[PDB]
Amino acid sequence: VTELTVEDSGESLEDLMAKMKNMMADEATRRVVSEIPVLKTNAGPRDRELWVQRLKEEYQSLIRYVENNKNADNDWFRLESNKEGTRWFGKCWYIHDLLKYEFDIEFDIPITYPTTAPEIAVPELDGKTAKMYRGGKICLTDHFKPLWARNVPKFGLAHLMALGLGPWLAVEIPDLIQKGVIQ
C-alpha cells in the first residue's frame, strides 16, 4: 500500500517558503483589512496641521468601512467626534437570537496616536463582564496591541473597530446574553 509520501511537483523552495506564508497569515484579518483603506500620515493630536490631515484620512477610512458594512448588511456601528477629532462617541448593534443589542461606546485619542491605539469604553456594560478594565474600557485580545504596532501608522479608527471592538463583541455579547446581565 502506497503510504502518503512526499511526491515531487515543479515548485521551487521559494515557491514553497512563500506558499507557507500564504497559509501562515490570518485570512480573516487579511480579509477584514484588505477592504479597509489604510492610512498614511503619522501625526498625533498635538500636531496641528498634520493632525488635521491624519483626521481627514481617519474620516475617509471610516466612511469606506461603514460603506462596506452597509454593502454586506453588517452596518453595526455609528460614530462621531468633537471638532478636534480628539474625542469620539458612537453605538454598536450586536444581533444574537435575532435580538438586537445596542451599546454606548466612547474613546479618546492618545497623545501618542497613531503609535498608541485608543482604549475604547462601554460605560454601561461596566461591571457585567470580565474582559473589561474599570470604568468600561474593554480589554481586547492579546493579538491586537502587537498587530497594531507592526502596521503603525497604517491602521486607524476603522481598524480599531473592525479588529478590536468587532471581535470583542462576538465574544462577550453572546456570553452576557446567556448570563442574562443583558436580556
Residue numbers in the entry: 36 to 218
Could you give the paper's own sentences about this structure?
Analogous to ubiquitination, ufmylation is carried out by a three-enzyme cascade involving E1, E2, and E3 proteins. The E1 UBA5 has three distinct regions: (1) an adenylation domain that binds ATP and magnesium ions; (2) a UFM1-interacting sequence (UIS) spanning amino acids 334 to 346 that holds UFM1 in a trans binding mechanism; and (3) a UFC1-binding sequence (UBS) from 392 to 404 that binds UFC117–21. The adenylated UFM1 is then subjected to a nucleophilic attack by the catalytic C250 of UBA5 to form a thioester bond with the C-terminal glycine of UFM1. This is followed by a trans thiolation process, whereby the UFM1 is transferred to the E2 UFC1 forming a thioester bond with C116 of UFC1. However, UBA5 does not harbor such a domain but instead has a short sequence called UBS that is responsible for the interaction with UFC128.
Therefore, to gain structural insights about this region and how it interacts with UFC1, we attempted to crystalize UFC1 in complex with UBA5 347–404, but with no success. However, we successfully crystallized and determined the structure of UBA5(347–404) that is fused to the N-terminus of UFC1 to 2.65 Å resolution. The asymmetric unit contains one fusion molecule, and UFC1 interacts with the UBS that arrives from another asymmetric unit. As expected, the interaction of the UBS with UFC1 retains the same architecture as observed in the structure with the shorter fragment containing only the UBS sequence. In both structures, the UBS binds to the α-1 helix and β-1 strand of UFC1. However, for the linker connecting the UBS, we obtained electron density for residues 382–389 but not for 347–381, suggesting that most of the linker is mobile. V382 (the first built residue at the N-terminus of UBA5) is 35 Å away from UFC1 C116. While this distance is far from the active site, UBA5 residues 381–363 can span it, thereby we cannot rule out the possibility that the linker reaches the vicinity of UFC1 active site Cys.
